[PDB]
Amino acid sequence: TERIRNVALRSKVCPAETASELIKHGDVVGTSGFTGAGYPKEVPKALAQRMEAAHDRGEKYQISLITGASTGPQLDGELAKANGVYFRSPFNTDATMRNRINAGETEYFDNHLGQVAGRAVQGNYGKFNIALVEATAITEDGGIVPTSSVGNSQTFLNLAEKVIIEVNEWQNPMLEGIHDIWDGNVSGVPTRDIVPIVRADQRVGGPVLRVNPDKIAAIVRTNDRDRNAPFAAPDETAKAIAGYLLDFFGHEVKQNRLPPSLLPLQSGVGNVANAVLEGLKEGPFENLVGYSEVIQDGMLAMLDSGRMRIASASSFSLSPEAAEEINNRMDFFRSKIILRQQDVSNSPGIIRRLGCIAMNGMIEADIYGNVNSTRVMGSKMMNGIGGSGDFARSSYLSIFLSPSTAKGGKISAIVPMAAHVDHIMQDAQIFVTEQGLADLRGLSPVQRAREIISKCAHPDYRPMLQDYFDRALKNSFGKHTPHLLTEALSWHQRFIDTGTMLPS
Amino acid sequence: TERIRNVALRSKVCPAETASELIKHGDVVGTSGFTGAGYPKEVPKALAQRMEAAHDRGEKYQISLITGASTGPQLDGELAKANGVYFRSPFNTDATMRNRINAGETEYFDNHLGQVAGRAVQGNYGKFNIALVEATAITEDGGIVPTSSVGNSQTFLNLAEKVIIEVNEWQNPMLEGIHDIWDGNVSGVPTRDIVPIVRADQRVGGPVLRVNPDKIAAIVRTNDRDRNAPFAAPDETAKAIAGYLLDFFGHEVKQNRLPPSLLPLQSGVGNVANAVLEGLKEGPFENLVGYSEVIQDGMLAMLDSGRMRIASASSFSLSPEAAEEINNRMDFFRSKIILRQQDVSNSPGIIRRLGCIAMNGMIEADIYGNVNSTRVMGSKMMNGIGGSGDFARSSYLSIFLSPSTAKGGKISAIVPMAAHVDHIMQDAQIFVTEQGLADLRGLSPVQRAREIISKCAHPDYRPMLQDYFDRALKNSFGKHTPHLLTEALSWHQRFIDTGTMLPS
Numbered sequence A, B: 001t002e003r004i005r006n007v008a009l010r011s012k013v014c015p016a017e018t019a020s021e022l023i024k025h026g027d028v029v030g031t032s033g034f035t036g037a038g039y040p041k042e043v044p045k046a047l048a049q050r051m052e053a054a055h056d057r058g059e060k061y062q063i064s065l066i067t068g069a070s071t072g073p074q075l076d077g078e079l080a081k082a083n084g085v086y087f088r089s090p091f092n093t094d095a096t097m098r099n100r101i102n103a104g105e106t107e108y109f110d111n112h113l114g115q116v117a118g119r120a121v122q123g124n125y126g127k128f129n130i131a132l133v134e135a136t137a138i139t140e141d142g143g144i145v146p147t148s149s150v151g152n153s154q155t156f157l158n159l160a161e162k163v164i165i166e167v168n169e170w171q172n173p174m175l176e177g178i179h180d181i182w183d184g185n186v187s188g189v190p191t192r193d194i195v196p197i198v199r200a201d202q203r204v205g206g207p208v209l210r211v212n213p214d215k216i217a218a219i220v221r222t223n224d225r226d227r228n229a230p231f232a233a234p235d236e237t238a239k240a241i242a243g244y245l246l247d248f249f250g251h252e253v254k255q256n257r258l259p260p261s262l263l264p265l266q267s268g269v270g271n272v273a274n275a276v277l278e279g280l281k282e283g284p285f286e287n288l289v290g291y292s293e294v295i296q297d298g299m300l301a302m303l304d305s306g307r308m309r310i311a312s313a314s315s316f317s318l319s320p321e322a323a324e325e326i327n328n329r330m331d332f333f334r335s336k337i338i339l340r341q342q343d344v345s346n347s348p349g350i351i352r353r354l355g356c357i358a359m360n361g362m363i364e365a366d367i368y369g370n371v372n373s374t375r376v377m378g379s380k381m382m383n384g385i386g387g388s389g390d391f392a393r394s395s396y397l398s399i400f401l402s403p404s405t406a407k408g409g410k411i412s413a414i415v416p417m418a419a420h421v422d423h424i425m426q427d428a429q430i431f432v433t434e435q436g437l438a439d440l441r442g443l444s445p446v447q448r449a450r451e452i453i454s455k456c457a458h459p460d461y462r463p464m465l466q467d468y469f470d471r472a473l474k475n476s477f478g479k480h481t482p483h484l485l486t487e488a489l490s491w492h493q494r495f496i497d498t499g500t501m502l503p504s
């Protein structure tokens, strides 16, 4: 069944190699792609090959690459190998690209995900020369049907001088209808429009990205696969964390601080997230609702079981198994899922209005409950802040969850001072590890420290943490947030020097 | 003429001392008061004396004090002198209260100002025993007309078990009508109402605070002045900063990145703020609009001249001469100013929608442009984060302005690593000192550092900053945000140990 239903736009079909030639050295390129879903695949590959060849000849050939969020080996991977990206934003998870970033070979800034569209329109990244977007189909009307994510695609389409569409036959035609694209002013020139969303399941727009066809310079027929999440079940540590949170949710409900169906939930990806979602699947809270960035295995299962009514997101992040399931039952799931532009899914105005519960991971937290989401030892990028700040600050409740240790016990997730800060004390109310849960609402910093140390820290590290805090209370410059500046970052340096935070 | 226009409530008038007897040890007390304006005065003084008396007899007497933001000598001052406050939130500028906080004698948490009402309703502060609110008048139907600020007063009235009103005849009767109080769900239980503000000059509510008269336990007739702080006359450092900033606005206009009337402006108070307001007054930009936390002297000047068309705020913050000016012309200024609940003035949804330009001060920034607004050496509280987070993250443009040094040259305002972080890199785009202006838009951390070091740091400290940076780039665990953890906080320790950050 022909995917390009606009007859005239079929004349714009050309090979991936020829399309890649439209991209010039120095260009700013905006692409689809979010949580490894719906990023362009073939043009980037071709571009990378031509970039390597050019380099060998002595011709500079790099681009600035702005995405929705993370992509995959075909985009981030290949361009990184070719050393073809001089600047990248706002979120990467490709190892090759991560290495370029951490070597200082590619410049990187991890903007709040919900702000990217607005900053792009304001001109922060420069003029967009190209928008390269993956499509499931093109409608008779010239509408562009997105694939497994929406991300920033509508904005990039608006901004770009020229547009390249990759129509990918690998993607399920039945995705058509699942997306909700608003034509209102969310991220454009002030004064912006009021975004009329008052319920997580409320659609406000249409199923297609809009673009002036005069701007489409090439359409490339492709056939390649998105990246998948791993099929891996939560361990005992994740389950313990999930148990503490579920008990908390229960107590809140019983105290009437949460409705029996809780509030719209924002969850992440990974073992902890999956344990929480697995817990909620069999939990006592009915008619749950999701207002998140991503649809993962967990949320799929609850939508399946009926324990969750609807789920809003910008993207998918599914195991091969889960992907097989949804593709077989797309007509069922399409009625349960809304995929939104990321500047809507991640809108602080909407998140606060709906009263979302934010549940996020972290690298580390200090004893006062400042959170590092990004930079190991304060300098080595992991993934990026992503939407954790959009949600943490705007949510009804901001919860951070993590194993109390990393690297086989050689690193403590609770430290005297975070080597880098992404979420300040004000943006984190609840902490959970396999050791217990710390409820920090209404507490001063010294009060926070007492809860975090006593409830959350691993027994191997707790006495060391208490010792730091007790000595700081005694000798710190001020006593409002006591620190010993000579040792605040010493555990981190000790890891660097010896490979462990534990004394020898 | 009579300020209490509802006859029934006149029966609840009583002496300040007697009213203060309603407040018991351990009570949570919510009061009016924001930037030195509109806080209760006589009841707190009476309370303080009774506390001191109890203490002398070995009897405990302390309260939890929750406010709009800063108060004055009659409130924060007296109670702190009496050691009568066990917990304080969210924002203080009184020097005695500051000492209690930094000595560990008063527990303190500086919540984001826009969030305080919401967290209070969620119960983070506990159950409110008392609301203590200053009024201009009481209307025929028992509405409470606020005075020189709105702050959190409507929310404290809703929550408190008992209410005490201070009717202050020092306050101008023609303040009635200047306030806009909404009965919509801004900070209550989700789902919240949409706050329909699409223009800075838009009113959405009415002129009075509402309260069940059955809750009013006392009314005190008073006559006492707000804290009208002396006008901070711009110095050459401030004039230079304003000069760089205004030059910057000028360039943005000519490149069509701002309209000729700029965008809604949020500014603070003091030296630099005053210099900026004077520059706008003399500047080329017409039809300016203020959407801020406070109205200051310089704003009044533009409203008078017609350079500014409207000013939205939660509070006044005026010198004696400005206070007298508006008092003789309250009818004129009443038409040009809207005072709002602080959960509306500081609403991220609205700030972003309007596209405000945020201009804020700081203690320090590190070379990567993370900002500390609160904690000296990381441990000693100054004032509090206030609304800087509300505005910085939500704004169209986030600007931080400061002298490049402090303590007469002995401290650098630009450092290797900030001792405490209030505003992450993502929340700060422009830095201005008397040395120059750093435009960070679209830059990676390393690129930010190169701009901050060259444009903003003081010549006394630039070489030291550059040497830290150079060696970090060579040795740091990762090269994305290079640091040397052995010396990142060493300048702060040097200051603690020697009284200067410069070496010997």
Ligand SMILES: CC(C)(COP(=O)(O)OP(=O)(O)OC[C@H]1O[C@@H](n2cnc3c(N)ncnc32)[C@H](O)[C@@H]1OP(=O)(O)O)[C@@H](O)C(=O)NCCC(=O)NCCS
Pocket: A267, A268, A269, A270, A271, A272, A293, A360, A361, A362, A363, A364, A373, A374, A376, A382, A383, A384, A385, A386, A387, A388, A403, A406, A407, A411, A412, A413
């Ligand atoms: C913080 C974050 C990296 C943790 O991921 P996670 O999978 O949930 O946690 P994990 O325990 O599995 O650890 C992930 C990696 O970080 C490393 N890590 C975690 N904590 C660490 C620490 N304190 N020190 C050093 N490394 C650490 C782990 O070693 C692991 O790396 P590895 O693959 O080499 O073993 C992740 O949540 C993230 O990138 N956050 C930012 C984006 C975001 O929050 N978006 C919001 C919704 S998705």
Ligand SMILES: CC(C)(COP(=O)(O)OP(=O)(O)OC[C@H]1O[C@@H](n2cnc3c(N)ncnc32)[C@H](O)[C@@H]1OP(=O)(O)O)[C@@H](O)C(=O)NCCC(=O)NCCS
Pocket: B267, B268, B269, B270, B271, B272, B293, B360, B361, B362, B363, B364, B372, B373, B374, B376, B382, B383, B384, B385, B386, B387, B388, B405, B406, B407, B411, B412, B413
């Ligand atoms: C950060 C802040 C304290 C700066 O104040 P400012 O008026 O701009 O400039 P100042 O230099 O006069 O700061 C005042 C004090 O901070 C001290 N200070 C400033 N920078 C310092 C530094 N790097 N190290 C140590 N002390 C410093 C000054 O010495 C001064 O001390 P003092 O009160 O004993 O005289 C102030 O902006 C603030 O409290 N910010 C938080 C709230 C806010 O931004 N809300 C939004 C609208 S106001």
Ligand SMILES: [Cl-]
Pocket: A193, A194, A195, A196, A349, A350, B349
């Ligand atoms: Cl909105």
Ligand SMILES: [Cl-]
Pocket: A440, A441, A442, A443, B111, B119, B124
């Ligand atoms: Cl709180």
Ligand SMILES: [Cl-]
Pocket: A349, A353, B193, B194, B195, B196, B349, B350
């Ligand atoms: Cl709103």
Ligand SMILES: [Cl-]
Pocket: A111, A119, A124, B440, B441, B442, B443
């Ligand atoms: Cl940016």
